């Protein structure tokens, strides 16, 4: 039994938001507004990333609705609200039995003046596998039409060919394209020169050569240290003219100091979560970041009293999600050794428990680090982090070392995600694959070296629409066709649950 | 429960501040701190980290498994905060182990680690005031048993209640840390009572005493990063003593505040091990290392060894699940209500025990208003207890400020509020509010000088003989001092010793 969640007591101020500028003057004017803003701007990750990291993405539309309008009116200073993409699309269907499209429509109505930001995985939009180009373009068209205003487009290997088409589609739909560099490694560690400052500079130059409106720096594992953050942001600001959007996780406890370091260097936007859903593997707290910068040269653009009022509601509704809580959470600097993103951390822990190795999770994480080194020190983020996690699980579960796969390897049946990674299905890693180990991994199957979307089976939306209309009881909308293409079986199971249980999204949590 | 993981250390064998103290004395330690370019770290894992997170319930049995690893694997530590605070009372009352026994065992296990204790000035580890000779005897015995650093503070930042303790610590050849409790916001012009000049003058006065180190205690984590930089700078250009900053991470800004203070030139900062850090506890030691890694000043610590130690601490924290606070998020409302973490938890518990937990929000608002009504006082033990009790009283019987100011001449205010307004805790900065004080005491004697002057005299010979009667043997000096500080608690501990024996030897 729970009391009603506390409702915020706001002090409303009418301002013109970035969403209003986008609606009236387009993406370039929004870019100018961000460029002309002296304060650092904030993107609230509460609706997507905060509960993806802390609550296994299980946060429901019903709890979102009770506070969405309060966020829209009480925090008009926000650059945007990250409310879509990531694991939310799949999790909604699969586990919450609510449509991500329905969530987007309801929030869009409730939040007219808030810019809606989505995490978009480049060639595999919200999936884990590459889709043909027209599928990606159609997804982007529907997402922009239904109210996504900002597309943070990233590729799990920082491979620009996998991002170009999505960036172009976002621009063609009159929305804001965020081209993302995934940060990994340590630019201040000379012993690790692969992802050095020059690598990021060149990548940022290439991304700016695209039409991307904003350059995002995505630190999926909270690897960006404060001095590293200041240096990287400074070098990027000297290399390109796009506004910078930094996104970090607080898993090592250094999120606030990293954000302040980037703010000194001139970052434009930083990703924050509400205090009650912040810290740990989630983003740094928005209230905390306000007080960190309060009397410095640059302030955080936010109504902190209103944010503290909103946080009471978020604190109350988090209690509904006790079964999905991770547990005791402390700052964890081991993330600097094993570069596992939080989602990869929890999923790997769960899989090790199901496998029956939870007592050896320490050497599981060591295997993760060594597997990453064996694959060639790859950027570990969805879905590339799944590859490393699966390989490490496989190598501990059958007691393999590096030499075991390098000499005995030709006999083992490596997990399919490792195989798919080494066939080039995820794209091309920086510096290419390790040729010998690639030969061991893919014994005989075909290996591609170009954009996997080129080799994607063609999809025609008319036949898919007719077939879906047969499979479900009615004529599907464009969003439903796009969902069926991305997650075929998941969408059908969701339709089955809709026919059998109805809109359970209306139930209170 | 699995056996806690033991650290795999890489030992370096360097000379520590404890060695300098043992061979060359406190002044040489101060010079060593002054000459150190890096920021030095004080580990609060053994006292403050588990006082904040585990209700001070961490037992000697768990400390023993890792004490030597801390001593050898982290020789760079300036000191380990392992005594004082609520630990002294809690050990006896709830853990049924002697704080003196803990100190002796840890001292043996940690020969090269400087032991730091939180000392409450006029009170040693109690909540009331004690006569001067009792405080001096406590300091003598604590220094003899192995306490090397005494962080001496007074709950109202009143120097007369710290002078005697500082002098006794110096006379015993140990390091005296004179402490300013931080409160308010030195960068908020609308709250001028505790401005930068107040702290500067207090620091000058403290340096006039023989204090070796000036400590800035931010019991509630109120010190914001820009404020931290500015305050440490102004203090650094005011006095010559090294600065020792201690903050809590309640608002989520502990690390950034420490980095700001490191920029301003703070010499020592208080950190907890990662597994017992964050939230209402201190910022993480590993986190503070990686925060400063490539800046002008590094943190002096073997971070690999610290990360190894943290595995053990993480494992043993699981034994203390019944004492956990719960889901912990950064909380910037501490800037409004300046509750210290311990005051926060105890106030929550008391409100629940009287059926008011559903309105803890207005309870905290009452706490803030009560603080403003008492005159914006420094809220730390035991002064924070006074504000907490008054706020509980006013919500529980539905009073406002007008109620106590007009109708208040007939209610029975709680005794700790009465004791505070009688001057038993000392004299607040700016004095008491005249009308409220009269309404509060209503008949009783109000003193304006050091309460220890009017403390009933204590003679250790008669106390020792009486204690030897009450227990079955002749007590040591530490046992006499404990009996004077906590008479009933010590006797109940002796009863439990006679009945159950040394339960401290059991695993948690
Ligand atoms: Mg700007
Ligand atoms: Mn993220
Ligand atoms: Mn403290």
Numbering used by the authors:
A (entry chain D): 486 to 994
B (entry chain A): 487 to 994
Give the exact sentences the study uses for this entry:
Pyruvate carboxylase (PC) is a tetrameric enzyme that contains two active sites per subunit that catalyze two consecutive reactions. A mobile domain with an attached prosthetic biotin links both reactions, an initial biotin carboxylation and the subsequent carboxyl transfer to pyruvate substrate to produce oxaloacetate. This enzyme possesses a tetrahedral geometry with the tetramer organized in two layers.
The separation of reaction steps at catalytic sites does not reveal the large conformational changes in the PC tetramer that could be coupled to the function of the enzyme. To explore the conformational space of the tetramers we performed a multibody refinement using masks enclosing dimers of BC-BC or CT-CT catalytic domains at different layers (as the bodies shown in Fig. 1c). There are only a couple of patterns related to the CT domains: showing a positive correlation of the same catalytic state when they are in the same layer; and a negative one when they are in subunits from different layers bound by their CT-CT regions.
